[PDB]
Amino acid sequence: PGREILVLHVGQGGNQIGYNFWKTICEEHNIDIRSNQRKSVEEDKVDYKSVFLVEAPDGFHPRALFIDLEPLAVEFLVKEMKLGSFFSEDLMVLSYSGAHNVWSIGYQTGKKLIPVILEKIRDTMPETLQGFLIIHTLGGGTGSGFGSLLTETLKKEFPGKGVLNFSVLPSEVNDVTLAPYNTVLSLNHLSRFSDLVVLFDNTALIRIVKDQLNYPVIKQFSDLNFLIGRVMASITASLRFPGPLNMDLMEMAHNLVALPETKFIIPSVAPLTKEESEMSTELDLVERCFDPTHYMVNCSGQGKTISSVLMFRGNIAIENAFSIMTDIKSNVAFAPGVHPDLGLKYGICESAPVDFDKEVTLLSNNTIISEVFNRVLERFDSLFNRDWYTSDYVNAGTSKSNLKEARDNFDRIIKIYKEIEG
């Protein structure tokens, strides 16, 4: 026993992403998410289901909690997707009042539910648990504020376990006017308490779906969130399936985090379709991952890579994975201090994602984060310098001085990334 992970889904976005993640995990392990059972003995593959799944005598269950301050997002999701016996009631921590898109309300109100969450965690977590994944959006109030609270709480309550965040940044035009406040407060909290923050934003995700998958229409968030689930599944694949070169959560974090503050990560995956997986080389897929068209954060260019983790899944030619490394280092811009021989961390897993021949997933610690974060900061300053929208932060325990303190720490992180850029 060991390597187990517990996933916390927080707020509307975090729980809706949870559906796609758990659907992917069950499919990869040939588990029927509706019966809780293996689909068959004959197609049961050699694997390690316990990373994300709890096997009980009756069947398999997610090692997850589904957390929100209002019940509708989760309840509607469970009904629509017929998840009632997988996203079961004993895994739900739901209130009634909502955070009303204010980080401070999510943080304060979430405090009331922390005892229940800790009891549920301590009720079912194996002692060998390797860490926690927190899935949330940063632009709303619950994912941002309650998710920040949970990041702080778990790091304090379970020292020695990893705390990783999968966090959705606001779109290029924000669809929550309060998002700059919520995003700065969240990123400040995660800089203090998270071990690694993997970032996404909907502008990039929509671009990928429309331009790489060519979906005719996006009618539900399930036709966006599958990309986040794919990253979460693929970067943990070598914990769950055989392969030549496996890596765990903190192994990946240690290879990425050059300085303690540089823990904000941009993910990408290639290819996006089965047809492309059958007509691509390892070199082509890695080049796609390092191209801004495939970044799941909206970026103006390639930036400068400080450090990267690449997971090769499936029908991978190991000699190609290694021989292209000089090409990667020559064709991709790395930060000035990165030695020509350094900056790459490899995992290789024999299991391809569903019906694909092969797939590459990239986690990049890239100086371009400074540009992404500077834009958030500019949005923040446009509100804060006018004292707009501050009242309900102040009324919920975040003073105007506190907002400024969070902004100034956020700026310090931006400047660290910019300094590494040269």
Ligand X SMILES: Nc1nc2c(ncn2[C@@H]2O[C@H](COP(=O)(O)OP(=O)(O)OP(=O)(O)O)[C@@H](O)[C@H]2O)c(=O)[nH]1
Return residues touching Na ion (CB under 5 A): 12
DSSP letter string over 252-303?
HHHHH-SSTT--EEEEEEE-SSHHHHTS--HHHHHHHHTSTTTBSS--SS--
Residue closer to Na ion (CB basis): 81 or 363:
81
Residue closer to ligand X (CB basis): 136 or 263:
136
Least Cα distance to 310 among 264, 267, 250, 259 occurs for 267
- CA distances 58 to 6, 36, 372, Å, are 20, 8, 46
Q: Could you tell which of Na ion, ligand X, none binds residue 50, using a CB distance below 5 to 8 A set by kind?
A: none
Least Cα distance to 400 among 374, 380, 415 occurs for 380
Q: Give the binding site for ligand X (CB under 6 A).
A: 11-13, 16-17, 69, 98-101, 137, 139-143, 168, 170, 175-176, 202, 205, 221, 224-225
Q: Could you tell which of ligand X, Na ion, none binds residue 110, using a CB distance below 5 to 8 A set by kind?
A: none
- Output DSSP code: residue 96: S
- Grouping H, G, I as helix, E, B as strand and the rest as coil, residue 156 is helix
Structure tokens at 358: 């092969």
Q: Could you tell which of ligand X, Na ion, none binds residue 16, using a CB distance below 5 to 8 A set by kind?
A: ligand X
Q: Could you tell which of ligand X, Na ion, none binds residue 349, using a CB distance below 5 to 8 A set by kind?
A: none
Please state the closest distance from residue 220 (CB atom) to ligand X, in A.
Answer: 9
Residue closer to ligand X (CB basis): 18 or 131:
18
CB < 8 Å & 24+ apart, contacts of 328-331: 328/286, 328/290, 331/287, 331/290
Please list the alpha-helical segments (H only) found in 138-281.
147-157, 179-193, 202-208, 222-235, 249-256, 274-277
- Output DSSP code: residue 142: I
Q: Could you tell which of Na ion, ligand X, none binds residue 243, using a CB distance below 5 to 8 A set by kind?
A: none
Residue closer to ligand X (CB basis): 68 or 195:
68
Q: Could you tell which of Na ion, ligand X, none binds residue 420, using a CB distance below 5 to 8 A set by kind?
A: none
CA 283 to chain centroid: 25
Least Cα distance to 98 among 69, 71, 74 occurs for 69
Residue closer to Na ion (CB basis): 85 or 222:
222
How many other C-beta atoms lie within 10 A of the C-beta of residue 161? 18
Q: Could you tell which of Na ion, ligand X, none binds residue 224, using a CB distance below 5 to 8 A set by kind?
A: ligand X
- CA distances 174 to 192, 325, 331, Å, are 25, 38, 34
Residue closer to ligand X (CB basis): 186 or 305:
186
Residue closer to Na ion (CB basis): 12 or 130:
12
Residue closer to ligand X (CB basis): 218 or 250:
218
Backbone angles phi, psi at 401, to 5 degrees: -60, -40
Residue closer to ligand X (CB basis): 86 or 221:
221
Please state the closest distance from residue 222 (CB atom) to Na ion, in A.
Answer: 17
Please state the closest distance from residue 356 (CB atom) to Na ion, in A.
Answer: 33
Please state the closest distance from residue 165 (CB atom) to Na ion, in A.
Answer: 18
Strands 344-349 and 305-314: parallel
Q: Could you tell which of ligand X, Na ion, none binds residue 280, using a CB distance below 5 to 8 A set by kind?
A: none
Say if CB 221 and CB 168 are below 8 A apart: no
Please state the closest distance from residue 397 (CB atom) to Na ion, in A.
Answer: 20
Please state the closest distance from residue 74 (CB atom) to Na ion, in A.
Answer: 10
Q: Could you tell which of Na ion, ligand X, none binds residue 141, using a CB distance below 5 to 8 A set by kind?
A: ligand X
- Grouping H, G, I as helix, E, B as strand and the rest as coil, residue 409 is helix
Please state the closest distance from residue 65 (CB atom) to Na ion, in A.
Answer: 16
Please state the closest distance from residue 97 (CB atom) to Na ion, in A.
Answer: 11
Please state the closest distance from residue 166 (CB atom) to ligand X, in A.
Answer: 11
